[model samples]
Target: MFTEIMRYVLDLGPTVMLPIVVILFSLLLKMKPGDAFKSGIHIGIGFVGIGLVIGLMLDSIGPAAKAMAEAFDINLKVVDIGWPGSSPMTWASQIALIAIPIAIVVNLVMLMTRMTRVVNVDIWNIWHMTFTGALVHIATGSYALAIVGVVVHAAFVYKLGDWFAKDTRDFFGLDGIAIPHGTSAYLGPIAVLVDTVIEKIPGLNRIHFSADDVQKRFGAFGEPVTIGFVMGLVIGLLAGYEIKAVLQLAVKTAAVMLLMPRVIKPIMDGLTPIAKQARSRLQAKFGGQDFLIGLDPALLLGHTSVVSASLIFIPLTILIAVVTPGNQVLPFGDLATIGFFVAMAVAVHQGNLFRTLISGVIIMSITLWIATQTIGLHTQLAANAGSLTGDGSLVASMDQGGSPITYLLVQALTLENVIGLVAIGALYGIGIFLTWRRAKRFAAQAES
Candidate 1:
């Protein structure tokens, strides 16, 4: 009975859950019934559209990624199954059953304590935290430890979300939304550090390039479709495609660039009112205390820097995968998600294309190496979850497979390599310290 109920709820997917929550939330805030329903429906439609476009994008890019791998004869032992494969494996674990309630409780507690003010409703993405805990369980064979891991991951992400909330909202023009997404948001600390390092470089710090600059300099050629076409052309050529195939790839890429924002606009339209309603309620209930609504990182993908950097990096990541020594994961399916991976980083760079690219390259390089290292464990998780029906010998995901924190947790918990674990922990400690310092400054400014 419990298993069946879990499946039923999980299968609702985000498209259904988001609208349901929005409508209920609007009603709780005493929004007019008609407006609330309209907003909810629009939000659902927008999310559905996003889902469709993403599916189309993955379809469009999957073939190219595969072809590129074959062309290069990159016979990686671990097959890149992408997030679609890994996410389900995470959900299948026992820990996922309670991940949502625990994470929500954690969010509320933090909000009440003023440790964070982000009311996270992106429940579907909670699978990320669940994945971490589940992996730890596999490593330690302890449910209690697994639950602890989940709580820690959730707390960390919420704090990170609070840290980036202002920039994320300002950059996306989302007045009260915060993105605490597991994949992209985790990089917020590292991105801040990378951008800080670049700032100290005398000559490099002087360089500046942004989407707006492209528009001013190139006019028609600066349009997203045109940029997408050029990027697609470059990627096609890199993939060693013939002229006809290259043109086809360019057109498809151009289509993705054109369609993504149009699909997102309605979702933003839907979110705006709900955000306003939530703000009003919070102010009414808490005597004007400030708060932000946590959302999925998908909403940030429509930004120019994100789209441009991701398109540029699809080919660049493949190249890096080819060249990076001791790397075994071929970045195939996850190649389509480069935008999400780079969104927060681009925000940290303040939409500066040059800086975002440099940071993106370094990030992908690290991801590749981490993904390669975790393949054996990743494969084990898949097999245990029964999600691996194939030979199940080789399985990996560029996103979760490359997760640095997850790797650290496994290493620390299992005591596989205590020295290496401590080293990585210290590295994270630095990132957390830097992020917290900046967060304090930002928070002080916000209050002022």
Candidate 2:
């Protein structure tokens, strides 16, 4: 019975979960029943609008990605399903039933100990952690290690949510919120580290163009809608579309830019009262402690710089796939969702289009390499999870296949791969130091 219930909730997707969570949060904030229900419905409508726009964008762009692949004569063995394509496979794996409980317990323990302040209510995203667990379980044949993999990764992701809360909140003008979505939020730390290094370089640091400056100088042409239209037109041209098709693509892109924020507004409306209430309760109960609401990265998708980075990376990822040797994954379905992969980078760059695009290219390059490396394991998992049929063939996801952390974890656990073990250890060592420094700084400020 519980297993069925879990499957049911998982299947509802974020569109349904967002409204339910909004209502629950409203009630917790002491909102009247009627008001809470109304606010929930408002958020539901907003989520629907956002989902619709995203679907339309994907529908329009998926063909372009395929066309680009064909135009470039890029032939890769792996069929790129994007993240959504692999989601069902992950959920059907052996670890799916317990992955949610493991994630929830990990979050609760971290919150209780104050090791993390992110209240991760986006329950549906637990699949990311579960995907990690599924991979480890498949490789090692150890159920215990699979559970550990989920918990450890969830903890790391929660810390990421806490670490990037300030920049994300500041960039979006959203108070007390952090994005914990696996794909996009994972890039936050890398963005911070990369941007810091860039800042120290003399000439690189001097280049300070941003979206606001562009809009200020170019007026309407610099606007996100116009930028999207122009980008779509260029993509259409590159894909060898006729002028009429190019114009249609341009308008669809413009619509996505204009509609996203408008839909996001209602979610903000629903969250405002809940945030205020949470603050009051925290002040009263904990003597002025604070916490952040961890949300899906979908909220970040509405930002202009995020949209711009995604559009830029669509071609960039395709180009990387073609040129990068040993890369078998052809990015198709996931190409349109590049915003989720580069959203935090834009925040780190303070909406600087140039810096964001550079960071995005670097990130995508690494992801492509990792995806290429993991094709064998991914193919095996797909077959076991019943996501694929026929002779064991190549398959990959830009989202899952591109995950560096997962790749490292699997390699380290296998213990046969010396290079992977060393890389994972060094990566986590740096991560630990950065996280400790951030924690200390926050503690010092609180004391002062």
Candidate 3:
């Protein structure tokens, strides 16, 4: 019993550590402990809770697909649960399952050569592990495939953890990497540019930018190349399943729903202050535009260590915590992952835990509503397919790894989750309105 409890606690490192760390950081930073705890808990709850749900969702789908595919003699091709088609990883593996080893070999050579000199270790390692996990999932349709992913991530991060707190290696006056939600929207192009050249310029930095300048100019997509590739594989293999589409839609919808809420607003707000600082720093550092291009935080924001530390660091840390040997999966891992992301999300924008938590719950409410909608569709389809299979559960009829194209089904948006996001926005807007009203009243009285 004691061992079981220990396992669960270790699985939930973020939840367990968040409060303690927040308290400690608050004490060290000399801030309000109560407010510090509030932000930490709020972000922790949302981030970790979402991660837990995702794990649960994967637990159901991964095993079910393996069992289902065995009955049909179909090759459950691509592995992992993200992108469904048109990914480099899926395409490479389709040509040969052996491509996994070949790709690894090539990656090793590239790393040894000057090819990887500019790329950071974290990004490079993610690509390698993502591909390895995908291939392993195809080779063995088990949750254990995901275990490999969890392990590799943990090991890589262990190296980093030591580096930051220790003195073995020098970062050489360099900053960190900021990963946006994959190459989904604006963050992709900007990331590619910065990772390649903009960040390498000698002695000039642009890590601070106004919200308006950054968002409008930088674009949203970063580099979830792995997720996209995995999604493509799932779509290819699961063509006959209804629940498969629902799952796909659910994951993507949850991701999207989480993005448009309080996270976006606060990030934008923090950028307003940072951008002004960037302009002055640029003038002082490089002696104005004649000697160098004036620094705009929008240009340099995504490549800096701060952004990387917030997003990549916590998630990687959680992955490490999960592999402490004999750690049982917990109910909170999903949400904790979500909270970690939320913390990173707000942290990047110069936000504290309080603001992030309030924002994270708003995102969580959106994800839950989407989950309900997904379950509703799962119910409806199971009923429709019941006459054919005799087992009414949607899990029974679905193919394992990859369904054929005929398996595809249409999905409608979940109104509940959408409404929740909008509603949260409305509440925030009202708060802003009230603040404005109070300011006006105070000004009028002073004048009178």
Candidate 4:
């Protein structure tokens, strides 16, 4: 009954449920009921607008992405079913029902204990942690251990929220907001490490360049609409589309770039008042200390740099899959939504696409590698959830299916791949340490 209720609410999509959260939070934080109701409706409308644009994006680019794959003859073993497939399988897990409360309780305790300053309002994203537990439950056959997986995953992500608080605020200009969304948050440490190394190189360190930087220099040539136009042409040409289709794609792509930020504005507007009130209320209790309100990666898509970077990666990921040796998962379902994997990297690189490209390459590379590694478990998870649609298709994803933290926990507890654990653990641990130091420095700078 409880699981069904949770599923039913979540299945309503962020459009409906997000408004309820906004309205409730607004009222709880002492905003007027009328104001709260309006806030909720605006949020709903924002999501609707976001969905329209995203659907347009997927409808436009998804086919070209596949066409590009076929034109290049890039074939891989496992199919990357993306969040659409993985999320349902995760929700169907035995552990999914309780994961939400566990997350809520964990966040409360963390805030109470001053373990973190991130008030996570991105409730829908908690599935990333639950996905970790679902995998753990499958591996260990222990509900208790699976529950522990969810707790630890939840705890660590809040810490990630604190660590990247500066990036989201200063770099993305998202004041009072932190992105604790799983895919973006977990993959961000890799960008930090890449940035650190490149900063030491004389030639590389000087590459503080971005699409906006280009627009500044070249004026009209580098505008978002222009970038979208050229990108559409390039992708369509590569997809073997004739000139008419290519031209149509160019126009539509430009439309999406212009419209993306327009839709995102409503989400930010609706979230801003709520985030401010929530943080201010929490700060009053926490001795005038302001906390970050965690939000969706969809919010990140609003930034022009992120949208531009996302477009570049759609075709690039397919190339990466073909080039990256031993990669089996074809970059398909996640192509249109690649922004989630690279949003923080864009900010971390401070919108420097030159730098973002390098970090993004590594990011997609790691995602594909891990996605390849987890193919068997992912297929089973899908089967367990009864999400398998085809007769015998193996399912994988670049989201939770490829997360290192999830992979680390499951492997550590199960000890199935001791050598793999040792390697990824060491590298991921180093990334986190550097990320921690960077965050501390960023926080200090903010304080000063």
Rank candidates by lDDT, best first. Answer: 4, 1, 2, 3
Summarize candidate 3's per-residue lDDT along 1-448 as a digit string, tens digits: 6444533543455445434544454455545556556555554554345344345434543333333333333222211222221133333332222332433343355345522211122222233234334434433445454344434423432222222211101211112222211111111121222222324655433344433343356445322322322332343244344665546643542342243232323323322323344445546764442111111111122222223222222222223323323222111223112222232224323323333333333333332222222332323322432321454432111111111111111111113345544653454334334333433564367459
What does candidate 4's lDDT look like per residue over 11-98, in tens digits?
8877888789778878878998997888788878888888898898789887887677667765686778888778888888877778
- Per-model TM against the reference: 0.94, 0.94, 0.27, 0.93
Model 2 lDDT per residue over 1-448, tens place:
9888977886776668767877887787887888888777777777788788888878897688667766877678676788887787787788887888888899999888888878888887777888788888888889998899899889988988887776667787667787876687775666666676787999988887787787899998988788999999988988999999999998888788888888888878877777786787768886766788787778888888788777778888888787876677887778888788888888878877777867777677777877777777777778877777776667788786678667778887887668756764565456446644655676578579
Runs in model 1 deviating more than 4 A are 1-5, 240-242, 389-392
TM-score, candidate 2, is 0.94
lDDT of 4 at 372: 87
Candidate with the larger lDDT of 2 and 4: 4
User: In order, what lDDT does every prediction score?
Assistant: 0.80, 0.79, 0.31, 0.84
Instruction: State each candidate's clash count.
Output: 0, 0, 58, 0
Q: Candidate 2's C-alpha lDDT? A: 0.79
List runs of model 2 lying over 4 Å from the truth. Answer: 12-16, 421-432, 435-448
